[PDB]
Amino acid sequence: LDLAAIRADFPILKRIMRGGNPLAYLDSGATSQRPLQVLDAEREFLTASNGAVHRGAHQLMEEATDAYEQGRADIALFVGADTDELVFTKNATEALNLVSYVLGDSRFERAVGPGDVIVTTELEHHANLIPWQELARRTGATLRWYGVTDDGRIDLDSLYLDDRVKVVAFTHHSNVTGVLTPVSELVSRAHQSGALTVLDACQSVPHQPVDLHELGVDFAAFSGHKMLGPNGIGVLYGRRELLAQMPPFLTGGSMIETVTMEGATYAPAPQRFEAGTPMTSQVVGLAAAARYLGAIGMAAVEAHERELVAAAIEGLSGIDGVRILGPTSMRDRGSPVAFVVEGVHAHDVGQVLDDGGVAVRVGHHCALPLHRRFGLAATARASFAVYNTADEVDRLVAGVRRSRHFFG
Amino acid sequence: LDLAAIRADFPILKRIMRGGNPLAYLDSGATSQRPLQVLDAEREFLTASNGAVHRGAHQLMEEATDAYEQGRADIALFVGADTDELVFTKNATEALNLVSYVLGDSRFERAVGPGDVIVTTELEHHANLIPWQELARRTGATLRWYGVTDDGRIDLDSLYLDDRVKVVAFTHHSNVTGVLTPVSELVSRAHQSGALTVLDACQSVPHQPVDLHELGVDFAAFSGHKMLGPNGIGVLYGRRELLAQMPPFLTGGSMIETVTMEGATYAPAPQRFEAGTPMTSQVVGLAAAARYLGAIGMAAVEAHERELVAAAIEGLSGIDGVRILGPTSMRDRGSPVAFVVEGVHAHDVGQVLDDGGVAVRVGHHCALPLHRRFGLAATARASFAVYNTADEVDRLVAGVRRSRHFFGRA
Amino acid sequence: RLEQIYQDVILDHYKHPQHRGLREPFGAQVYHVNPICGDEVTLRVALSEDGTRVTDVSYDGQGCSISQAATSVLTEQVIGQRVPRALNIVDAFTEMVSSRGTVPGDEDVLGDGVAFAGVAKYPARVKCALLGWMAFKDALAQASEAFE
Amino acid sequence: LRLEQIYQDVILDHYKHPQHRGLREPFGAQVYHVNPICGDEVTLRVALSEDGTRVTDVSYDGQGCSISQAATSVLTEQVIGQRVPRALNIVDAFTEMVSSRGTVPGDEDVLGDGVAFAGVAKYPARVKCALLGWMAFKDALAQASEAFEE
Ligand SMILES: *Cc1c(COP(=O)(O)O)cnc(C)c1O
Ligand SMILES: *Cc1c(COP(=O)(O)O)cnc(C)c1O
Ligand SMILES: [Zn+2]
Ligand SMILES: [Zn+2]
């Protein structure tokens, strides 16, 4: 891959920060930056073909509808789904909520109730935790969780086969430890109780090849804005056969088959799960982001990010009193790199890095139970994207040494 | 109003359509077009200040968080709300769903149950109907409704509220008949049972001055993409005191204050109601749309749209066998104009208009109970925006006349 | 003119529609609605004594010129035909109207069916054209199940 | 040097040598506050005089960054011994300075070492670090005053 060419696609990467250094953006794990192909795909659509989708029958409606459904097809190809298995939401969080609500719905045969068990993990982002707490609260189902190994991996030895388990929710790829999870083993175990699997793929889809059929998960969620796409668009994957059995979550226009004052019947999937005007221009932008990543190639993206991640782990590990949260090994590991600086609070570490133009996240990264499990209040997190460079990793390492000097 | 200068802000209005004529876009009721000020406010944000909101502490995070919370404040000023009384959703539909789900939650003290009555209207867009049917289904509450007058207004004589009524949901402004509803009367009636009011304001916020404190409704929903703003952003208004009493709907990151594997406690409103990464650049865009409309002046917008509506009613009324669904007067009426052509199916009327470059919606406009009440399977709908012209209304009328000639009706 | 979409065959069947009105006997009955809000059909298929030939297609409902003309033309092409030949004609029609301007259709296979070639260019109206055809496909599959 | 302008000597000093640390008896109110910038927390007590007119003690524990811990230390030095209303005025001057995005330098006569947090204001994310102990005190003071009579 031509890294200089790739970086030339992202206007924001030229920015000079308040400390006088060019941006080193190491927070793509929170939200990614946009290349011109994504900005221009969206603006070209809005200035030429902006009309209602699937509503009426004029020329702009036909063009907007074509762009909406071709975008769904492009994104499905990118993640190894069929077109009809993707549902658009405002974010990944909403996708996991949709599944968490349908699993409590009397009209769904696979809904959970008292005596049933929901399993999540102590590694999870809050988006793949709080909806399971709420589903347990509403239905009287029991919540359980896999624990975390000392190296920040899902602890497969921490739960055992239980016929009561009906839902197993787990990350594909940790947003803190960077661990790549044993999906095949977790699915095989889920199937031993006839449990449904819910894959949090927010940090896999931007960072590695993903084939959702191959993975054999029942559901998966991912986030447009983390994969170079627009804000305001998430995706739920659901196996065709499962979406067909599922009652709607949000209701309103566009998702009905019939309506009277007394009641309604509902459209087939995926229209069943898209209530009201969709994020039409954002689908166009997200499809452009999928084509962009596809043109680099997701194996090449993962190889580049793994080079940066290893350099970060090795450079930070070379600083006395700096500890990684997650493995130092690159086995089954990718972005990001979360770390503690002995004797320097994460807020002070992030401030020093920021003074040098290096943007990292400080805090719990939306995974507080994970931090608590390691007795940590907060970490600094450098996350990596296809546009980041070895020189930005060197500036990360230099900033962390500077923070030790400045406070030490 | 400088109509020529306003139209110059909208690149799409120059488009030559497949029949050879410049676009005459009369479907802003379904989705509005974008001015450069909106497109540019969002692009400038994305290429300069794009970072996580309320998450970490770096420079881009501070700029993004500033843009998100200033956008909330700008939009609140536009609709007469306090900043903290707005919740961002993907669309107005989700905003109505959010209220419909919280009103069924055991943790809300105003939650509905067996014996309670939910009231909606036969005038409603499906977004302000289906969620109430589902709330009734989940809770055991029952659904009642106002009917519709022969002129397409809420029939206040068709329903008597009683003490069982806990929710009254209704349109501010019909997306089919164009009727402006009697909000202060419906609020007064709802209050006789201590019922909560839910206002569907999707066709008021873009088309007339709106002051949500003045209107005295408990909740309101509106749509960004109908008021010149981006896709992917709707707005829920809730009275500050009511939002403070409500449990969350969607849960996840950013809406929590504490978290263990066992449980969580939730942030105050409006953050309580915003789960996951918000639509940051779309808040920037919608804020720019509110500032754009504010600068024209919503009284001037309403006056302009009312001139187009009156000319449309006059011109269509003059065609033999054309009838309006909704008032033929301008009393308590705005956009849009929905109509039937005797002997010509709406699909055909719309195809003839489109051949002339005139875009109208054909179908039920997401208000099938309303159509069924008038024995209609579909109407053609001309909706108006600040960028539309009297010359475009003449093209609408000519195209409907042409559709009668083309299909051999006269 | 740029209609073209509204060919004489289409206007002709709309004004003078063939086989309209539900008839008996029938072996299955179906109710179909346009995703584009405004067209519907109730359609019956009768089969021969031996189940091998379509003996009747009867229907009612309301819709636009394109939905009603398409359904009239369907009945003209398919009544008195072998089930497999009926099925082939439906596939031919669906391929033509679904192709955007790309497939002209074969008049030997479609007869007046080819008049709907112009509709392919207008994807919203393709759903108008398909209503009666997909309704017949449903009712035929059901009538053949009924048979045994 | 921009870093020195936010991290002034007073801040590094109070951070390294904090004052009035460690929860004490007696006390009238106890609060627990957490910085939304996940990593800073304070448990803070206020004791009032026998007549309820003066703050006699501010005791605290918890964990956080240089800015959150230094600010709580400086708070205790500014409000210990002061009339309840004078403590309240000092908190309002502090909040106005640090919330000012750098437009208010603060009055050293009202804030004393408080003024050392002026350079925090142009880092709006770090303003919540500085406000943690001060908003904790405002909460505890209002609870300790209400508690008093009766
Ligand atoms: C457009 C509209 C809705 C739905 O808004 P979305 O943005 O589609 O979710 C609801 N009510 C009325 C009156 C409308 O016009
Ligand atoms: C970002 C993220 C989410 C939440 O996605 P949103 O787009 O914020 O809703 C969930 N899980 C993981 C692992 C993430 O990184
Ligand atoms: Zn039709
Ligand atoms: Zn701090």
PDB file of N, CA and C in Angstrom, chain B residues 281-354:
ATOM      1  N   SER B 281     -21.583  15.217  13.208  1.00  0.00           N
ATOM      2  CA  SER B 281     -21.556  16.108  12.023  1.00  0.00           C
ATOM      3  C   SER B 281     -22.981  16.452  11.585  1.00  0.00           C
ATOM      4  N   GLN B 282     -23.962  15.579  11.843  1.00  0.00           N
ATOM      5  CA  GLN B 282     -25.381  15.871  11.489  1.00  0.00           C
ATOM      6  C   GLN B 282     -25.976  16.911  12.453  1.00  0.00           C
ATOM      7  N   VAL B 283     -25.541  16.973  13.719  1.00  0.00           N
ATOM      8  CA  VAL B 283     -25.955  18.053  14.661  1.00  0.00           C
ATOM      9  C   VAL B 283     -25.412  19.376  14.126  1.00  0.00           C
ATOM     10  N   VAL B 284     -24.170  19.356  13.662  1.00  0.00           N
ATOM     11  CA  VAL B 284     -23.564  20.575  13.085  1.00  0.00           C
ATOM     12  C   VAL B 284     -24.389  21.039  11.897  1.00  0.00           C
ATOM     13  N   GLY B 285     -24.690  20.127  10.981  1.00  0.00           N
ATOM     14  CA  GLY B 285     -25.544  20.460   9.822  1.00  0.00           C
ATOM     15  C   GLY B 285     -26.918  20.991  10.224  1.00  0.00           C
ATOM     16  N   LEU B 286     -27.594  20.305  11.127  1.00  0.00           N
ATOM     17  CA  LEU B 286     -28.988  20.701  11.466  1.00  0.00           C
ATOM     18  C   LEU B 286     -28.968  22.083  12.151  1.00  0.00           C
ATOM     19  N   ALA B 287     -27.964  22.338  12.978  1.00  0.00           N
ATOM     20  CA  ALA B 287     -27.789  23.646  13.614  1.00  0.00           C
ATOM     21  C   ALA B 287     -27.693  24.702  12.510  1.00  0.00           C
ATOM     22  N   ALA B 288     -26.882  24.444  11.477  1.00  0.00           N
ATOM     23  CA  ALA B 288     -26.717  25.353  10.330  1.00  0.00           C
ATOM     24  C   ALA B 288     -28.080  25.536   9.638  1.00  0.00           C
ATOM     25  N   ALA B 289     -28.882  24.483   9.504  1.00  0.00           N
ATOM     26  CA  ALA B 289     -30.239  24.575   8.910  1.00  0.00           C
ATOM     27  C   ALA B 289     -31.150  25.485   9.761  1.00  0.00           C
ATOM     28  N   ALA B 290     -31.092  25.351  11.083  1.00  0.00           N
ATOM     29  CA  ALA B 290     -31.891  26.173  12.020  1.00  0.00           C
ATOM     30  C   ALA B 290     -31.454  27.634  11.904  1.00  0.00           C
ATOM     31  N   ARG B 291     -30.161  27.878  11.805  1.00  0.00           N
ATOM     32  CA  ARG B 291     -29.637  29.262  11.699  1.00  0.00           C
ATOM     33  C   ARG B 291     -30.080  29.845  10.357  1.00  0.00           C
ATOM     34  N   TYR B 292     -30.027  29.054   9.277  1.00  0.00           N
ATOM     35  CA  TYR B 292     -30.435  29.458   7.904  1.00  0.00           C
ATOM     36  C   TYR B 292     -31.912  29.876   7.909  1.00  0.00           C
ATOM     37  N   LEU B 293     -32.779  29.015   8.429  1.00  0.00           N
ATOM     38  CA  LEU B 293     -34.234  29.317   8.503  1.00  0.00           C
ATOM     39  C   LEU B 293     -34.482  30.518   9.428  1.00  0.00           C
ATOM     40  N   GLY B 294     -33.815  30.571  10.581  1.00  0.00           N
ATOM     41  CA  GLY B 294     -33.901  31.695  11.526  1.00  0.00           C
ATOM     42  C   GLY B 294     -33.596  33.030  10.838  1.00  0.00           C
ATOM     43  N   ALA B 295     -32.602  33.049   9.958  1.00  0.00           N
ATOM     44  CA  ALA B 295     -32.120  34.265   9.261  1.00  0.00           C
ATOM     45  C   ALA B 295     -33.177  34.696   8.234  1.00  0.00           C
ATOM     46  N   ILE B 296     -33.843  33.761   7.544  1.00  0.00           N
ATOM     47  CA  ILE B 296     -34.952  34.129   6.616  1.00  0.00           C
ATOM     48  C   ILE B 296     -36.110  34.654   7.462  1.00  0.00           C
ATOM     49  N   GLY B 297     -36.448  33.920   8.511  1.00  0.00           N
ATOM     50  CA  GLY B 297     -37.543  34.259   9.438  1.00  0.00           C
ATOM     51  C   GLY B 297     -38.718  33.350   9.166  1.00  0.00           C
ATOM     52  N   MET B 298     -39.146  32.600  10.165  1.00  0.00           N
ATOM     53  CA  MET B 298     -40.171  31.547   9.947  1.00  0.00           C
ATOM     54  C   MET B 298     -41.540  32.168   9.644  1.00  0.00           C
ATOM     55  N   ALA B 299     -41.835  33.372  10.118  1.00  0.00           N
ATOM     56  CA  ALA B 299     -43.074  34.071   9.697  1.00  0.00           C
ATOM     57  C   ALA B 299     -43.045  34.305   8.176  1.00  0.00           C
ATOM     58  N   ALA B 300     -41.892  34.686   7.628  1.00  0.00           N
ATOM     59  CA  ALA B 300     -41.725  34.996   6.195  1.00  0.00           C
ATOM     60  C   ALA B 300     -41.806  33.686   5.410  1.00  0.00           C
ATOM     61  N   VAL B 301     -41.253  32.625   5.981  1.00  0.00           N
ATOM     62  CA  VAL B 301     -41.324  31.275   5.369  1.00  0.00           C
ATOM     63  C   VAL B 301     -42.786  30.870   5.256  1.00  0.00           C
ATOM     64  N   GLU B 302     -43.526  30.964   6.354  1.00  0.00           N
ATOM     65  CA  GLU B 302     -44.952  30.548   6.409  1.00  0.00           C
ATOM     66  C   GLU B 302     -45.755  31.376   5.398  1.00  0.00           C
ATOM     67  N   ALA B 303     -45.528  32.681   5.353  1.00  0.00           N
ATOM     68  CA  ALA B 303     -46.277  33.600   4.454  1.00  0.00           C
ATOM     69  C   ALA B 303     -46.023  33.208   2.999  1.00  0.00           C
ATOM     70  N   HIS B 304     -44.777  32.917   2.665  1.00  0.00           N
ATOM     71  CA  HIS B 304     -44.424  32.486   1.296  1.00  0.00           C
ATOM     72  C   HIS B 304     -45.096  31.154   0.968  1.00  0.00           C
ATOM     73  N   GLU B 305     -44.994  30.178   1.872  1.00  0.00           N
ATOM     74  CA  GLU B 305     -45.558  28.842   1.607  1.00  0.00           C
ATOM     75  C   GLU B 305     -47.076  28.958   1.465  1.00  0.00           C
ATOM     76  N   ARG B 306     -47.699  29.804   2.276  1.00  0.00           N
ATOM     77  CA  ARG B 306     -49.170  29.978   2.247  1.00  0.00           C
ATOM     78  C   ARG B 306     -49.603  30.585   0.903  1.00  0.00           C
ATOM     79  N   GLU B 307     -48.797  31.459   0.300  1.00  0.00           N
ATOM     80  CA  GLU B 307     -49.092  32.001  -1.048  1.00  0.00           C
ATOM     81  C   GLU B 307     -49.055  30.884  -2.093  1.00  0.00           C
ATOM     82  N   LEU B 308     -48.077  29.988  -2.013  1.00  0.00           N
ATOM     83  CA  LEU B 308     -47.956  28.882  -2.984  1.00  0.00           C
ATOM     84  C   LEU B 308     -49.133  27.930  -2.810  1.00  0.00           C
ATOM     85  N   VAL B 309     -49.435  27.591  -1.556  1.00  0.00           N
ATOM     86  CA  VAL B 309     -50.562  26.694  -1.221  1.00  0.00           C
ATOM     87  C   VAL B 309     -51.865  27.283  -1.788  1.00  0.00           C
ATOM     88  N   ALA B 310     -52.168  28.555  -1.504  1.00  0.00           N
ATOM     89  CA  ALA B 310     -53.411  29.190  -1.997  1.00  0.00           C
ATOM     90  C   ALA B 310     -53.463  29.138  -3.536  1.00  0.00           C
ATOM     91  N   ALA B 311     -52.362  29.437  -4.231  1.00  0.00           N
ATOM     92  CA  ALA B 311     -52.325  29.416  -5.713  1.00  0.00           C
ATOM     93  C   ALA B 311     -52.529  27.979  -6.185  1.00  0.00           C
ATOM     94  N   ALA B 312     -51.913  26.996  -5.520  1.00  0.00           N
ATOM     95  CA  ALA B 312     -52.096  25.569  -5.876  1.00  0.00           C
ATOM     96  C   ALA B 312     -53.564  25.180  -5.740  1.00  0.00           C
ATOM     97  N   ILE B 313     -54.208  25.539  -4.631  1.00  0.00           N
ATOM     98  CA  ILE B 313     -55.641  25.184  -4.394  1.00  0.00           C
ATOM     99  C   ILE B 313     -56.475  25.841  -5.501  1.00  0.00           C
ATOM    100  N   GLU B 314     -56.246  27.126  -5.760  1.00  0.00           N
ATOM    101  CA  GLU B 314     -56.999  27.851  -6.807  1.00  0.00           C
ATOM    102  C   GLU B 314     -56.842  27.166  -8.167  1.00  0.00           C
ATOM    103  N   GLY B 315     -55.603  26.929  -8.604  1.00  0.00           N
ATOM    104  CA  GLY B 315     -55.294  26.305  -9.907  1.00  0.00           C
ATOM    105  C   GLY B 315     -55.849  24.893 -10.002  1.00  0.00           C
ATOM    106  N   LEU B 316     -55.650  24.018  -9.002  1.00  0.00           N
ATOM    107  CA  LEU B 316     -56.172  22.624  -9.075  1.00  0.00           C
ATOM    108  C   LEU B 316     -57.709  22.588  -9.010  1.00  0.00           C
ATOM    109  N   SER B 317     -58.313  23.429  -8.183  1.00  0.00           N
ATOM    110  CA  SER B 317     -59.788  23.580  -8.038  1.00  0.00           C
ATOM    111  C   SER B 317     -60.454  23.921  -9.367  1.00  0.00           C
ATOM    112  N   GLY B 318     -59.740  24.622 -10.240  1.00  0.00           N
ATOM    113  CA  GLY B 318     -60.238  25.064 -11.554  1.00  0.00           C
ATOM    114  C   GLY B 318     -60.214  23.951 -12.588  1.00  0.00           C
ATOM    115  N   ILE B 319     -59.613  22.803 -12.264  1.00  0.00           N
ATOM    116  CA  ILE B 319     -59.609  21.642 -13.197  1.00  0.00           C
ATOM    117  C   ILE B 319     -60.853  20.806 -12.898  1.00  0.00           C
ATOM    118  N   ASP B 320     -61.639  20.493 -13.941  1.00  0.00           N
ATOM    119  CA  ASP B 320     -62.827  19.613 -13.796  1.00  0.00           C
ATOM    120  C   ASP B 320     -62.354  18.286 -13.182  1.00  0.00           C
ATOM    121  N   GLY B 321     -63.072  17.801 -12.176  1.00  0.00           N
ATOM    122  CA  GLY B 321     -62.888  16.458 -11.588  1.00  0.00           C
ATOM    123  C   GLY B 321     -61.673  16.371 -10.671  1.00  0.00           C
ATOM    124  N   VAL B 322     -61.024  17.490 -10.365  1.00  0.00           N
ATOM    125  CA  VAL B 322     -59.951  17.507  -9.324  1.00  0.00           C
ATOM    126  C   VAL B 322     -60.569  17.903  -7.979  1.00  0.00           C
ATOM    127  N   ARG B 323     -60.301  17.122  -6.937  1.00  0.00           N
ATOM    128  CA  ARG B 323     -60.749  17.454  -5.561  1.00  0.00           C
ATOM    129  C   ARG B 323     -59.545  17.406  -4.613  1.00  0.00           C
ATOM    130  N   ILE B 324     -59.552  18.284  -3.624  1.00  0.00           N
ATOM    131  CA  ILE B 324     -58.503  18.409  -2.580  1.00  0.00           C
ATOM    132  C   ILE B 324     -58.908  17.536  -1.397  1.00  0.00           C
ATOM    133  N   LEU B 325     -57.960  16.766  -0.886  1.00  0.00           N
ATOM    134  CA  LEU B 325     -58.059  16.082   0.415  1.00  0.00           C
ATOM    135  C   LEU B 325     -57.548  17.043   1.493  1.00  0.00           C
ATOM    136  N   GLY B 326     -58.447  17.636   2.267  1.00  0.00           N
ATOM    137  CA  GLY B 326     -58.107  18.744   3.167  1.00  0.00           C
ATOM    138  C   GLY B 326     -58.859  20.020   2.792  1.00  0.00           C
ATOM    139  N   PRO B 327     -58.671  21.114   3.544  1.00  0.00           N
ATOM    140  CA  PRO B 327     -59.450  22.331   3.322  1.00  0.00           C
ATOM    141  C   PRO B 327     -59.164  22.924   1.938  1.00  0.00           C
ATOM    142  N   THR B 328     -60.186  23.496   1.324  1.00  0.00           N
ATOM    143  CA  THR B 328     -60.022  24.336   0.105  1.00  0.00           C
ATOM    144  C   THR B 328     -59.835  25.806   0.494  1.00  0.00           C
ATOM    145  N   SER B 329     -60.055  26.171   1.763  1.00  0.00           N
ATOM    146  CA  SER B 329     -59.702  27.505   2.295  1.00  0.00           C
ATOM    147  C   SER B 329     -58.289  27.479   2.848  1.00  0.00           C
ATOM    148  N   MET B 330     -57.815  28.644   3.259  1.00  0.00           N
ATOM    149  CA  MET B 330     -56.496  28.822   3.914  1.00  0.00           C
ATOM    150  C   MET B 330     -56.647  28.968   5.428  1.00  0.00           C
ATOM    151  N   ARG B 331     -57.831  28.667   5.977  1.00  0.00           N
ATOM    152  CA  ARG B 331     -58.040  28.799   7.422  1.00  0.00           C
ATOM    153  C   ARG B 331     -57.258  27.679   8.101  1.00  0.00           C
ATOM    154  N   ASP B 332     -56.319  28.053   8.967  1.00  0.00           N
ATOM    155  CA  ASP B 332     -55.558  27.101   9.817  1.00  0.00           C
ATOM    156  C   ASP B 332     -55.050  25.997   8.882  1.00  0.00           C
ATOM    157  N   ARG B 333     -54.346  26.410   7.838  1.00  0.00           N
ATOM    158  CA  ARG B 333     -53.862  25.472   6.804  1.00  0.00           C
ATOM    159  C   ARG B 333     -52.550  25.952   6.229  1.00  0.00           C
ATOM    160  N   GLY B 334     -51.688  24.987   5.920  1.00  0.00           N
ATOM    161  CA  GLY B 334     -50.452  25.261   5.183  1.00  0.00           C
ATOM    162  C   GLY B 334     -50.203  24.191   4.138  1.00  0.00           C
ATOM    163  N   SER B 335     -48.924  23.954   3.849  1.00  0.00           N
ATOM    164  CA  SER B 335     -48.461  22.844   2.994  1.00  0.00           C
ATOM    165  C   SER B 335     -48.849  21.549   3.689  1.00  0.00           C
ATOM    166  N   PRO B 336     -49.190  20.463   2.974  1.00  0.00           N
ATOM    167  CA  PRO B 336     -49.190  20.393   1.524  1.00  0.00           C
ATOM    168  C   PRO B 336     -50.594  20.371   0.924  1.00  0.00           C
ATOM    169  N   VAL B 337     -50.640  20.212  -0.382  1.00  0.00           N
ATOM    170  CA  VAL B 337     -51.915  20.039  -1.119  1.00  0.00           C
ATOM    171  C   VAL B 337     -51.922  18.644  -1.711  1.00  0.00           C
ATOM    172  N   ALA B 338     -52.817  17.791  -1.203  1.00  0.00           N
ATOM    173  CA  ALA B 338     -53.063  16.422  -1.702  1.00  0.00           C
ATOM    174  C   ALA B 338     -54.385  16.447  -2.469  1.00  0.00           C
ATOM    175  N   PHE B 339     -54.446  15.742  -3.582  1.00  0.00           N
ATOM    176  CA  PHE B 339     -55.622  15.842  -4.466  1.00  0.00           C
ATOM    177  C   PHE B 339     -55.783  14.547  -5.221  1.00  0.00           C
ATOM    178  N   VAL B 340     -57.031  14.402  -5.664  1.00  0.00           N
ATOM    179  CA  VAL B 340     -57.558  13.288  -6.499  1.00  0.00           C
ATOM    180  C   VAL B 340     -57.908  13.874  -7.870  1.00  0.00           C
ATOM    181  N   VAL B 341     -57.601  13.163  -8.935  1.00  0.00           N
ATOM    182  CA  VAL B 341     -58.048  13.504 -10.306  1.00  0.00           C
ATOM    183  C   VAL B 341     -59.072  12.434 -10.690  1.00  0.00           C
ATOM    184  N   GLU B 342     -60.353  12.794 -10.784  1.00  0.00           N
ATOM    185  CA  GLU B 342     -61.406  11.809 -11.143  1.00  0.00           C
ATOM    186  C   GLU B 342     -61.018  11.125 -12.458  1.00  0.00           C
ATOM    187  N   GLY B 343     -61.015   9.799 -12.475  1.00  0.00           N
ATOM    188  CA  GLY B 343     -60.737   9.027 -13.699  1.00  0.00           C
ATOM    189  C   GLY B 343     -59.254   8.871 -14.004  1.00  0.00           C
ATOM    190  N   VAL B 344     -58.346   9.412 -13.182  1.00  0.00           N
ATOM    191  CA  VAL B 344     -56.885   9.235 -13.415  1.00  0.00           C
ATOM    192  C   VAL B 344     -56.237   8.828 -12.097  1.00  0.00           C
ATOM    193  N   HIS B 345     -55.635   7.646 -12.076  1.00  0.00           N
ATOM    194  CA  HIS B 345     -54.951   7.103 -10.885  1.00  0.00           C
ATOM    195  C   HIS B 345     -53.782   8.016 -10.510  1.00  0.00           C
ATOM    196  N   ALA B 346     -53.546   8.181  -9.214  1.00  0.00           N
ATOM    197  CA  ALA B 346     -52.449   9.046  -8.703  1.00  0.00           C
ATOM    198  C   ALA B 346     -51.105   8.633  -9.351  1.00  0.00           C
ATOM    199  N   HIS B 347     -50.849   7.335  -9.600  1.00  0.00           N
ATOM    200  CA  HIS B 347     -49.559   6.863 -10.180  1.00  0.00           C
ATOM    201  C   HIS B 347     -49.368   7.528 -11.534  1.00  0.00           C
ATOM    202  N   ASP B 348     -50.459   7.638 -12.316  1.00  0.00           N
ATOM    203  CA  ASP B 348     -50.479   8.232 -13.672  1.00  0.00           C
ATOM    204  C   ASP B 348     -50.339   9.748 -13.577  1.00  0.00           C
ATOM    205  N   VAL B 349     -51.068  10.380 -12.670  1.00  0.00           N
ATOM    206  CA  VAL B 349     -50.959  11.852 -12.472  1.00  0.00           C
ATOM    207  C   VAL B 349     -49.482  12.150 -12.165  1.00  0.00           C
ATOM    208  N   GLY B 350     -48.866  11.365 -11.266  1.00  0.00           N
ATOM    209  CA  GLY B 350     -47.486  11.647 -10.828  1.00  0.00           C
ATOM    210  C   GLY B 350     -46.473  11.429 -11.929  1.00  0.00           C
ATOM    211  N   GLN B 351     -46.726  10.471 -12.817  1.00  0.00           N
ATOM    212  CA  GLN B 351     -45.813  10.136 -13.947  1.00  0.00           C
ATOM    213  C   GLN B 351     -45.871  11.278 -14.973  1.00  0.00           C
ATOM    214  N   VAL B 352     -47.054  11.839 -15.199  1.00  0.00           N
ATOM    215  CA  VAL B 352     -47.219  12.966 -16.156  1.00  0.00           C
ATOM    216  C   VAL B 352     -46.508  14.203 -15.613  1.00  0.00           C
ATOM    217  N   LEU B 353     -46.674  14.493 -14.330  1.00  0.00           N
ATOM    218  CA  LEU B 353     -45.965  15.627 -13.672  1.00  0.00           C
ATOM    219  C   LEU B 353     -44.456  15.435 -13.789  1.00  0.00           C
ATOM    220  N   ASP B 354     -43.965  14.241 -13.450  1.00  0.00           N
ATOM    221  CA  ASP B 354     -42.523  13.915 -13.453  1.00  0.00           C
ATOM    222  C   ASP B 354     -41.976  14.111 -14.874  1.00  0.00           C
TER     223      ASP B 354
END
